[PDB]
C-alpha cells in the first residue's frame, strides 16, 4: 500500500522521489503539536506546482492538514506560470523543479514570480553558477534560468524564467574519485534600489579576505536599476570556486539585512565559500543533495563520488535513509587509499530509471 | 567517396525529424537523422515513403546507400530486413 | 402542458448555457 513517514521533514524531497519512482507516497503528522497545524501556503503552492507539471496525479490533504496522500503521475510539463507566495522566494520552488526537469514529455518553460532571495533559500546564482553547472556534468547539456526581474524581500515581486532545453533518458554514470583542483574563484554581486557603492563595498569586503590566496578573482559588479530592479531595496553576494579541469564548482551565498555593514557581509561570502571548500571533496554539501539522487536514478551501473568527512552529517544520513525506502537503493562507502586526507568514496547504483514519458 | 570507399554504410536512427509535418508524403516526412557507426558522424537519410517511415524506429540498425536537396543517402535496409521487402508485405522486421 | 414542458426544457438549456459561459 502506501509508504508512511512522519513530519514535514524533507517534504519536497519525498514528493519528487515519489514522482521519479512512480511509487505512491503518504506523509503524515505534519506538525500535529503546533498551534497552527497542517501544511503551510508555500508547500501547498509547491504541491500545486507539481500538479501543473505532472499529469494524472491525485493529491489529497487531510481535514486538519496533517496528512497528505500522493500518487504520482507521468511527468509531462510545459509552458506555465506559477505564483510564489511571499513566504518563500522563487528559489525554493526552482531547486526541487531541477530534480524533475530533464525527464518530461514536453519542455519546461515555467515563469516563477515572487521574492527571489532569502537568508535560508537558494538564490538565482546558487541555481545558476552553483547548482546548474552540476547538470552539465550529469549529461544535461543545455539548461538555463533566465532572470528578467529580481525582487528583494519583504515585498519581492521578482521574475525568473526556467528553461531546460535538454531532455535525456537518465543521468550519465558518475566517475569522480579525485578531489578536483580549483583553478579560479568567480562570483556575482547584486543589489536593488541602492547606490552602486554598496556592490563595490561588497567586493572590497570579499576581496580583503581572499587576497592571501594566489588566485585570479573576478567578482561581477552587477547593479539592477529601473523598472526591473524590484519593489524593495535589497542585496546579497554569491562567490563560486570554479574548477576548469573537470568542470566542478563550489559556491556560498547569503543576503544582507537591515543594519548590516557591506564589508562585513562581503567578508562573509568570501570566507563563507572558503569554509565550504574545506568541508568538500568533490561536491559541496549544498550540491550533495543534487548529485546523489540523480545517480540513484541512473543506469544499472556503479559510479564513484568522492565525499569528505565533514559532508557526512545528519543531513547525509536522513537523506540517505529517505532514498532507501522509496528505491530500496543503499549507498555504500569505501575509504580512499590516500593518507593525506580521510575523504570517502560513495558508491551508488542507478535503478535503471528511463524517461518513458518522452516522445520517441 | 561518400562512405570513404564502401558502397554501403550502417547507421543508428536517432530521431525522425519529419514526424510533426502536416502534409502527407511531404519531402520532409521521409528525412531521418542517422549516426554513422564507423565514425559516429550524424547524417540525414531518405526513407522511400511515409508508409516505409512506419517501419523505421529509434535505435535500429540501418544501412545507407547513395541517393530537400543535400540529403545524399537513402535507407535501403533495416534491422535484418530490406525496407522494400517489408514495404511489399514480403517480410517482418526482426526485433 | 406541452408548452410548459418546452419552457422548462428551454430553461434547462439556459442553465447549461450559464454553465458553459
Amino acid at each position: 500500500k502506501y509508504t508512511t513517514f512522519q513530519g514535514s521533514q524533507n517534504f519536497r524531497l519525498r514528493i519528487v522521489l515519489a514522482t521519479l519512482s512512480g511509487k505512491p507516497i503518504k506523509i503524515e503528522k505534519i506538525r500535529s503539536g503546533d498551534l497552527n497545524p497542517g501544511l503551510k501556503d508555500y508547500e501547498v503552492s509547491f504541491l500545486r506546482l507539481i500538479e501543473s507539471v505532472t499529469n494524472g496525479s491525485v493529491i489529497e490533504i487531510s481535514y486538519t492538514g496533517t496528512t497528505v496522500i500522493y500518487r504520482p503521475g507521468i511527468i509531462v510539463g510545459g509552458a506555465s506560470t506559477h505564483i510564489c507566495p511571499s513566504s518563500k522566494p522563487v528559489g525554493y520552488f526552482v531547486e526541487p523543479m531541477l530534480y524533475l526537469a530533464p525527464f518530461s514529455k514536453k519542455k519546461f518553460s515555467i515563469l516563477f514570480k515572487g521574492i527571489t532571495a532569502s537568508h535560508n533559500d537558494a538564490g538565482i546564482e546558487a541555481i545558476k553558477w552553483g547548482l546548474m553547472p552540476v547538470m552539465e556534468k550529469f549529461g544535461v547539456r543545455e539548461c538555463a534560468l533566465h532572470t528578467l526581474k529580481r525582487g528583494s524581500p519583504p515585498l519581492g515581486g521578482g521574475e525568473v524564467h526556467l528553461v531546460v532545453d535538454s531532455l535525456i533518458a537518465q543521468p550519465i554514470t558518475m566517475h569522480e574519485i579525485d578531489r578536483p583542483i580549483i583553478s579560479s574563484i568567480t562570483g556575482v554581486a547584486y543589489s536593488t534600489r541602492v547606490s552602486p557603492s554598496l556592490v563595490n563595498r561588497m567586493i572590497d569586503g570579499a576581496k580583503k579576505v581572499l587576497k592571501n590566496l594566489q588566485c585570479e578573482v573576478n567578482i561581477t559588479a552587477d547593479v539592477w536599476r529601473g523598472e526591473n530592479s524590484g519593489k524593495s531595496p535589497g542585496w546579497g553576494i554569491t562567490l563560486v570556486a570554479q574548477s576548469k579541469q573537470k568542470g566542478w564548482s563550489y559556491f556560498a551565498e547569503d543576503i544582507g539585512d537591515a543594519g548590516s555593514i557591506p564589508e562585513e557581509l562581503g567578508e562573509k561570502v568570501a570566507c563563507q565559500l572558503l569554509e565550504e571548500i574545506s568541508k568538500s571533496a568533490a561536491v559541496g554539501r549544498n550540491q550533495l543533495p543534487l548529485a546523489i539522487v540523480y545517480m540513484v536514478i541512473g543506469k544499472e551501473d556503479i559510479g564513484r563520488l568522492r565525499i569528505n568527512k565533514e559532508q557526512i552529517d545528519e543531513r547525509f544520513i536522513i537523506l540517505l535513509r529517505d532514498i532507501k525506502k522509496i528505491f530500496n537503493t543503499e549507498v555504500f562507502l569505501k575509504p580512499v587509499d590516500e593518507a593525506d586526507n580521510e575523504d570517502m568514496i560513495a558508491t551508488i547504483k542507478g535503478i535503471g530509471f528511463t524517461n518513458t514519458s518522452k516522445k520517441i | 567517396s561518400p562512405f570513404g570507399g564502401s558502397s554501403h554504410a550502417k547507421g543508428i536512427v536517432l530521431e525522425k525529424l519529419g514526424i510533426e509535418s502536416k502534409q502527407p508524403n511531404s519531402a520532409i516526412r521521409k528525412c531521418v537523422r542517422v549516426q554513422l557507426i564507423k565514425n559516429g558522424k550524424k547524417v540525414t537519410a531518405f526513407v522511400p515513403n511515409d508508409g516505409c517511415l512506419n517501419f523505421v524506429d529509434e535505435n535500429d540498425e540501418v544501412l545507407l546507400a547513395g541517393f530537400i536537396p543535400g540529403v545524399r543517402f537513402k535507407v535501403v535496409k533495416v534491422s535484418g530486413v530490406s525496407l522494400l521487402a517489408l514495404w511489399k508485405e514480403k517480410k517482418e522486421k526482426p526485433r | 402542458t406541452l408548452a410548459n414542458n418546452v419552457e422548462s426544457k428551454l430553461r434547462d438549456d439556459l442553465e447549461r448555457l450559464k454553465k458553459i459561459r
Binding site: - | 522511400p48 515513403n49 508508409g51 514495404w87 | -
Partner: protein, 48 residues
C-alpha cells in the same frame, strides 16, 4: 512509383436518398461545373 494497387482503389459515389427521390438525381462536383459554366456563358452574353 512506390504506390500499390490498393491505394488506387475506386471510391464509389453515393446516390440521392430514397426519401428525397422525388426531387431528382443527386448532383456532384462534375455535374455542378457543367451548369456553372453554361450560366457564366449566359451572363457574359447578356452582359455584352
Amino acid at each position: 512509383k512506390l504506390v500499390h494497387d490498393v491505394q488506387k482503389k475506386q471510391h464509389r459515389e453515393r446516390s440521392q436518398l430514397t426519401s428525397r427521390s422525388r426531387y431528382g438525381f443527386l448532383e456532384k462536383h462534375k455535374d455542378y461545373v457543367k451548369r456553372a459554366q453554361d450560366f457564366h456563358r449566359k451572363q457574359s452574353t447578356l452582359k455584352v
